């Protein structure tokens, strides 16, 4: 039990998320912003981002407003097939097992 909804995205630097937009920007079947939306939990607002000029930019912007956790952003990337997207977050998250 024990309810929990705070989010740990505030810690993530702008420069860190900035790169995430360049990755999702890739119109691939397993590397698109829309694909990440489903993994994270924004499939309902998928059409909304599609209308925006930068869906990938609106995703993180809309996902952050509703909390936004790094544990989900890192896992969602591995579930699809991202490598750099995970290195950008882990690079800022800490510096132990992997860095850069």
Beta strands (DSSP E) in 1-100 are none
Domain assignment present for residue 98? The answer is: no
- Asked if residue 52 lies in contact with residue 16, where contact means CB atoms within 8 angstroms, the answer is no
Q: Which structural technique was applied?
A: NMR
Tokens of 79: 């579930």
Distance CA 74, CA 72 (A): 5
Give CA angle at 42 (23, 76), nearest 5°: 50
Domain assignment present for residue 99? The answer is: no
Tokens of 72: 């989900």
Domain assignment present for residue 100? The answer is: no
Domain assignment present for residue 96? The answer is: no
Domain assignment present for residue 97? The answer is: no
- Asked if residue 49 lies in contact with residue 37, where contact means CB atoms within 8 angstroms, the answer is yes
Distance CA 20, CA 24 (A): 6
Q: CA-based diameter of the chain, in Å?
A: 40
Count of the separate structural domains present in the chain:
1
Q: Which residue range is the domain that position 35 belongs to?
A: 1-91
User: Per-residue b/e over 62-76, b at no fewer than 16 CB within 10 Å?
Assistant: bbbeeebbbebbbeb
Other Cβ atoms closer than 10 A to 79: 15
Tokens of 34: 């829309």
Tokens of 96: 């132990």
CATH of the domain at 10: 1.10.533.10
- Asked if residue 93 lies in contact with residue 75, where contact means CB atoms within 8 angstroms, the answer is no
């Amino acid at each position: 039990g024990s309810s929990g909804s705070s989010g740990d995205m505030k810690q993530l630097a702008e420069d860190v998320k900035l790169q995430l937009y360049k990755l999702l920007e890739i119109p691939d079947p397993d590397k698109n912003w829309a694909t990440l939306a489903q993994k994270l939990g924004l499939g309902i607002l998928n059409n909304a981002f599609r209308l925006s000029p930068a869906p990938s930019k609106t995703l993180m912007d809309n996902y952050e407003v509703s909390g936004g956790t790094v544990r989900e952003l890192v896992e969602a990337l591995r579930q699809m097939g991202y490598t750099e997207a995970i290195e950008v977050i882990q690079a800022a998250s800490s510096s132990g097992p992997s860095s850069g």
